[PDB]
Design an enzyme around this catalytic site. Structure first.
Site, PDB file in Angstrom:
ATOM      1  N   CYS A   1      29.753 -48.876  56.290  1.00 43.71           N
ATOM      2  CA  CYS A   1      30.295 -47.746  57.036  1.00 43.71           C
ATOM      3  C   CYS A   1      29.020 -47.005  57.522  1.00 43.71           C
ATOM      4  O   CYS A   1      27.917 -47.538  57.338  1.00 43.71           O
ATOM      5  CB  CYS A   1      31.212 -46.866  56.170  1.00 43.71           C
ATOM      6  N   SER A   2      29.124 -45.830  58.108  1.00 35.45           N
ATOM      7  CA  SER A   2      27.932 -45.143  58.637  1.00 35.45           C
ATOM      8  C   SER A   2      26.761 -45.026  57.636  1.00 35.45           C
ATOM      9  O   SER A   2      25.701 -45.579  57.907  1.00 35.45           O
ATOM     10  CB  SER A   2      28.294 -43.782  59.219  1.00 35.45           C
ATOM     11  N   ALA A   3      26.955 -44.358  56.484  1.00 34.48           N
ATOM     12  CA  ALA A   3      25.899 -44.234  55.472  1.00 34.48           C
ATOM     13  C   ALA A   3      25.932 -45.365  54.426  1.00 34.48           C
ATOM     14  O   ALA A   3      24.962 -45.556  53.704  1.00 34.48           O
ATOM     15  CB  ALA A   3      25.973 -42.868  54.791  1.00 34.48           C
ATOM     16  N   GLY A   4      27.035 -46.104  54.363  1.00 31.93           N
ATOM     17  CA  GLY A   4      27.176 -47.195  53.403  1.00 31.93           C
ATOM     18  C   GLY A   4      27.444 -46.730  51.979  1.00 31.93           C
ATOM     19  O   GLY A   4      27.126 -47.454  51.031  1.00 31.93           O
ATOM     20  N   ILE A   5      28.016 -45.503  51.814  1.00 29.62           N
ATOM     21  CA  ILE A   5      28.376 -44.965  50.480  1.00 29.62           C
ATOM     22  C   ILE A   5      29.848 -44.491  50.379  1.00 29.62           C
ATOM     23  O   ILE A   5      30.491 -44.782  49.389  1.00 29.62           O
ATOM     24  CB  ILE A   5      27.395 -43.856  49.969  1.00 29.62           C
TER      25      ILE A   5
ATOM     26  N   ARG B   1      33.118 -44.583  52.632  1.00 26.50           N
ATOM     27  CA  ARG B   1      34.187 -45.530  52.925  1.00 26.50           C
ATOM     28  C   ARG B   1      33.899 -46.837  52.183  1.00 26.50           C
ATOM     29  O   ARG B   1      34.814 -47.471  51.649  1.00 26.50           O
ATOM     30  CB  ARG B   1      34.258 -45.779  54.436  1.00 26.50           C
TER      31      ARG B   1
ATOM     32  N   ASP C   1      41.658 -39.771  59.050  1.00 25.68           N
ATOM     33  CA  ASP C   1      41.049 -38.440  59.095  1.00 25.68           C
ATOM     34  C   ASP C   1      41.521 -37.681  57.849  1.00 25.68           C
ATOM     35  O   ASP C   1      40.709 -37.083  57.139  1.00 25.68           O
ATOM     36  CB  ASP C   1      41.489 -37.698  60.374  1.00 25.68           C
TER      37      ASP C   1
ATOM     38  N   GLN D   1      31.890 -40.601  48.466  1.00 23.58           N
ATOM     39  CA  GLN D   1      31.183 -39.427  48.933  1.00 23.58           C
ATOM     40  C   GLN D   1      31.913 -38.097  48.753  1.00 23.58           C
ATOM     41  O   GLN D   1      31.264 -37.092  48.501  1.00 23.58           O
ATOM     42  CB  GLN D   1      30.894 -39.653  50.432  1.00 23.58           C
TER      43      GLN D   1
END
Ligand SMILES: O=P(O)(O)C(F)(F)c1cccc(-c2cccc(C3CCCCC3)c2O)c1
EC number: 3.1.3.48
Length: 284
Positions: A219-223, A225, A184, A263
């Site tokens: 990862c969620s958006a792929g950019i 992480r 986090d 990001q």
């Protein structure tokens, strides 16, 4: 320099250590890097809405992964929100950065694994954040490919699955690394599990031998992480080979391949924390 002017800042050990701890310079540098996002009007494909987790995070057309089976001429069947990512020294297709599969893209994701001969998947998602669970409990078939989870290995920071992929007479192995220690707060004490994952994956990639097929990172958006994992992986090789790290030039290289790679500024600083720590570990 094809899509925007690349930037560079070659860091030796002392500057790297100090740079990781200078958030004011880091943000000045970070927010000068173009995002290189794709205009959503670049894609005019009926049914495309169901293929994207986010309408503004699209794959850059030049490096987009095209699904050539069963119809390369159909813009929708051919589509996946994924890009080929160059590795260290600009090597082509070392990685594929993709968004976490959604219910309507699970089978498309496995079509990509199969097409690309992907030997390794790196998934950066917390247990609480549950990306759709796209692998089976034991076995499942998608478009003629039988996917079997043969072994589950539980480590402190990742769950490793040894998966078998079978279609007709051909069988292939696949290693699925599910990393659960994404922090986090991107503080320096949270850097060692990511560094351990990077090192474990690069050793597994080397074991595939010459011309390793693309390693899928999501990862969620792929950019975000995904950008951190890939940038760290590239810079670890740069450090061992050149004795320096160029996170700025690496971030630009990633952005030319997929808009938005790394990001946030906190993620950008995290990469510096990981690289400063690796430099100290290597020094011994
Ligand atoms: O380290 P992490 O937890 O990944 C994080 F970076 F902190 C973080 C925290 C919160 C949200 C997102 C995020 C993830 C995917 C997509 C988006 C979109 C960006 C374009 C507009 C719509 C949302 C996000 O904002 C990333």
């Amino acid at each position: 320099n094809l899509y925007f002017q690349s930037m560079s800042r070659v860091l030796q050990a002392e500057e790297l250590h100090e740079k990781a701890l200078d958030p004011f310079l880091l943000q000045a540098e970070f927010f000068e890097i173009p995002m290189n996002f794709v205009d959503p009007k670049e894609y005019d494909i009926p049914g495309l809405v169901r293929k994207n987790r986010y309408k503004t995070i699209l794959p850059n057309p030049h490096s987009r992964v095209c699904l050539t089976s069963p119809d390369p001429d159909d813009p929708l069947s051919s589509y996946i929100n994924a890009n080929y990512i160059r590795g260290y020294g600009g090597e082509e297709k070392v990685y594929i950065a993709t968004q976490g599969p959604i219910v309507s893209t699970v089978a498309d994701f496995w079509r990509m694994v199969w097409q690309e001969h992907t030997p390794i998947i790196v998934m950066i998602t917390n247990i609480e954040e549950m990306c759709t669970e796209y692998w089976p409990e034991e076995q499942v078939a998608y478009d003629g490919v039988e996917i079997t989870v043969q072994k589950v290995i539980h480590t402190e920071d990742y769950r490793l699955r040894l998966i078998s992929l079978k279609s007709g007479t051909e069988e292939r192995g696949l290693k699925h690394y599910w990393f659960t220690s994404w922090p986090d707060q991107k503080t320096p004490d949270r850097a060692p599990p990511l560094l351990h994952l990077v090192r474990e994956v690069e050793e597994a990639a080397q074991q595939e031998g010459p011309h390793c097929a693309p390693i899928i990172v999501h990862c969620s958006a792929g950019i975000g992480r995904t950008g951190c994992f890939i940038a760290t992986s590239i810079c670890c090789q740069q450090l061992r080979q050149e004795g320096v790290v160029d996170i700025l030039k690496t971030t630009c290289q990633l952005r030319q391949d997929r808009g938005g790679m790394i990001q946030t500024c906190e993620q950008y600083q995290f990469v510096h924390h990981v690289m400063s720590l690796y430099e100290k570990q290597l020094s011994h």
